[PDB]
Design an enzyme around this catalytic site. Structure first.
Site, PDB file in Angstrom:
ATOM      1  N   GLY A  59       0.884  -1.137   0.018  1.00 15.09           N
ATOM      2  CA  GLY A  59      -0.083   0.003  -0.051  1.00 15.09           C
ATOM      3  C   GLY A  59       1.098   1.133  -0.254  1.00 15.09           C
ATOM      4  N   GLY A  60       0.246   2.237  -0.593  1.00 13.09           N
ATOM      5  CA  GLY A  60       1.268   3.413  -0.631  1.00 13.09           C
ATOM      6  C   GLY A  60       2.096   3.376  -1.836  1.00 13.09           C
ATOM      7  N   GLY A  61       1.664   2.859  -2.714  1.00 15.45           N
ATOM      8  CA  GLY A  61       2.630   3.060  -4.285  1.00 15.45           C
ATOM      9  C   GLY A  61       3.558   1.706  -4.138  1.00 15.45           C
ATOM     10  N   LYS A  62       3.490   0.982  -2.950  1.00 16.76           N
ATOM     11  CA  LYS A  62       4.457  -0.193  -3.018  1.00 16.76           C
ATOM     12  C   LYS A  62       3.413  -1.502  -2.667  1.00 16.76           C
ATOM     13  CE  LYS A  62       8.702   0.939  -0.903  1.00 16.76           C
ATOM     14  NZ  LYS A  62       9.082  -0.201  -1.624  1.00 16.76           N
ATOM     15  N   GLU A  80     -16.337   0.607   0.209  1.00 19.86           N
ATOM     16  CA  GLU A  80     -16.136   0.798  -1.295  1.00 19.86           C
ATOM     17  C   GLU A  80     -16.541  -0.482  -2.219  1.00 19.86           C
ATOM     18  OE1 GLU A  80     -12.293   2.076  -2.396  1.00 19.86           O
ATOM     19  OE2 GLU A  80     -11.887   2.779  -0.439  1.00 19.86           O
ATOM     20  N   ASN A  92     -13.247   1.269   4.734  1.00 17.33           N
ATOM     21  CA  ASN A  92     -12.175   2.093   5.283  1.00 17.33           C
ATOM     22  C   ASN A  92     -12.635   2.160   6.780  1.00 17.33           C
ATOM     23  OD1 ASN A  92     -10.144   3.930   4.099  1.00 17.33           O
ATOM     24  ND2 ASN A  92     -11.674   3.834   2.247  1.00 17.33           N
ATOM     25  N   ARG A 152     -11.898   4.112   8.834  1.00 17.51           N
ATOM     26  CA  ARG A 152     -11.567   5.677   9.052  1.00 17.51           C
ATOM     27  C   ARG A 152     -12.571   6.785   8.117  1.00 17.51           C
ATOM     28  NH1 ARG A 152      -9.584   7.338   4.811  1.00 17.51           N
ATOM     29  NH2 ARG A 152      -7.698   6.254   3.703  1.00 17.51           N
TER      30      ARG A 152
END
EC number: 6.4.1.2
Length: 499
Positions: free
Chosen positions: A220-223, A328, A343, A345
């Site tokens: 996650g986070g582009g990784k 989602e 999510n 959050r």
């Protein structure tokens, strides 16, 4: 950040409110585990409610964290807060994301709660965990809920157990057996959803079909993510994902061939009750970024979107969710939807929903955190057609007045050509408001109907363009919003490319 827009409907102190509203815990000092716009909206929303309830905007004191950076730049959030504690600079792990740090400051002040909103430690279950173990409340789901929810692998098994459509993946078909007691996925069933090597990965990969996505749950986070399109690339791609997020469990999932992205807004108390607050539409994205967003989601037939609402509530109730969260979905041109994730959050595009349902989310979050039950939250009572301050139980499942969203909203993510966040004002259109953090920002437009929502947003972006750092960057938004394809809300989103 917009906070929204004879007897005595006010108490004298948090204490009285908690008591008077079926509360069970008093929170009057809150630590904000974040900065920027998040820190601003959190205070503004809560303070607006504090004023309405205590005739005192400061009834709920706020302590923020300030890194040597934010401090020098003169972030507005710093002077807003009631107390602030200086923290180490550098990446977030040295601050806003350092959980040990947060619980440490949380204990020493001390505060009765912490709010992290989105970003940083907002989704790290070790935060509420460590907070509760020290008797500090959390304006978000309890660690158990996030645990019981887990990563995509775990949550998908759970969506599947509850019989919610999902995209074909390495774990398709896996379920668990399902009065109290939240659901939990056995470590053995969980592993049946992963892939240990190129050998078995390729196995499932053939069962799913190409193209597909290779994803590490810890990623996650582009990784920890790759797009495999053929068996000849899977091997290198799968090893790539391993070298990027080592040790992480990996799973494969079919690549959705351009569909709609719909969200459901969930709100739940600490008593088993959860409701939907309509949802958001975010099918417009530019390189993994939610550019334009709608609310509610009209693209889908109310009958089908309402079903997604129920599943969403079901999913939430099962993991014993608490507070606000997003589920989602992936709605297809025909009528097929698939659960994608939940999510744990609040999100940054939340003002949309606050606007169509008249609910101050951060304030709801705080009241739920004090043990106030949904039917005792003024904003919900009103949304359900009930009495503003009554004590009457509300049947959420089969309401006598099925809530209707008030208007339509458009949200556009904007970018530039002392302070960290700048509030935006528009003399042109009046149903629009926005902010800009200095990098990116958002604008929220309200309209009697979708037409007026789009219209207003536009006239606003134009006023925005007069600004120097906005003479170009927002031009394509206007062109995009004015395209006829968008005007008629075509089920197809392909047109976004050849713009």
């Amino acid at each position: 950040s917009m906070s929204g827009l004879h007897r005595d409907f006010t108490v004298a102190s948090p204490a009285e409110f908690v008591t008077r509203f079926g509360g069970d815990r008093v929170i009057e000092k809150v630590l904000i585990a974040n900065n920027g716009i998040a820190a601003v909206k959190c205070m503004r929303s809560i303070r607006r409610w504090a004023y309405e309830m205590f005739r005192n905007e400061r009834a709920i004191r706020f302590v923020v964290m300030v890194t040597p950076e934010d401090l020098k730049a003169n972030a507005e959030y710093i002077k807003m807060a009631d107390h602030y504690v200086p923290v180490p600079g550098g990446p977030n792990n040295n601050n806003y994301a350092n959980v040990e740090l947060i619980v440490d400051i949380a204990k020493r002040i001390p505060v009765q709660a912490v709010w992290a909103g989105w970003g940083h430690a907002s989704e790290n279950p070790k935060l509420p965990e460590l907070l509760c173990k020290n008797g500090v409340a959390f304006l978000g789901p309890p660690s158990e809920a996030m645990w019981a929810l887990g990563d995509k692998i775990a949550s998908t098994v759970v969506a599947q157990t509850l019989q919610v459509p999902t995209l074909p993946w390495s774990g398709s078909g896996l379920t668990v057996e399902w009065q109290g007691k939240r659901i939990s996925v056995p470590e053995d069933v969980y592993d049946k959803g992963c892939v240990k090597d190129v050998d078995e990965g390729l196995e499932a990969a053939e069962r799913i079909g190409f193209p597909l996505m290779i994803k590490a749950s810890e990623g996650g986070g582009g990784k920890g993510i790759r797009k495999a399109e053929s068996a000849e690339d899977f091997p290198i791609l799968f090893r790539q994902v391993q070298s990027e997020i080592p040790g992480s469990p990996i799973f494969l999932m079919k690549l959705a061939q351009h569909a709609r992205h719909l969200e459901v807004q969930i709100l739940a108390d600490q008593y088993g009750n959860a409701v939907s607050l309509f949802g958001r539409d975010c099918s417009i994205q530019r390189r993994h970024q939610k550019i334009v967003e709608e609310a509610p989601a009209t693209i889908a037939p109310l009958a089908i979107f309402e079903f997604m609402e129920q599943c969403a509530i079901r999913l939430a109730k099962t993991v014993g969710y608490v507070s606000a969260g997003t589920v989602e979905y992936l709605y297809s041109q025909d009528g097929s939807f698939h659960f994608l994730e939940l999510n744990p959050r609040l999100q940054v595009e939340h003002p949309c929903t606050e606007m169509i349902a008249d609910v101050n989310l951060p304030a709801a979050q705080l009241q739920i955190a004090m043990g106030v039950p949904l039917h005792r939250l003024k904003d919900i009572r009103l949304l359900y057609g009930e009495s503003p301050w009554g004590v009457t139980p509300i049947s959420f499942e089969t309401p006598s007045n099925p809530p209707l969203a008030r208007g339509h909203v458009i949200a556009a993510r904007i970018t530039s050509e002392s302070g960290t966040v700048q509030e935006l004002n528009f003399r042109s259109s009046k149903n629009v408001w926005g902010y800009f953090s200095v990098q990116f920002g958002h604008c929220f437009s309200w309209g009697e109907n979708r037409e007026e929502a789009i219209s207003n947003m536009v006239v606003a972006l134009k006023e925005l363009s007069i600004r120097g750092d906005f003479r170009t960057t927002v031009e394509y938004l206007i062109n995009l919003l004015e395209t006829e394809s968008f005007q008629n809300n075509d089920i197809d989103t392909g047109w976004l490319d050849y713009l």
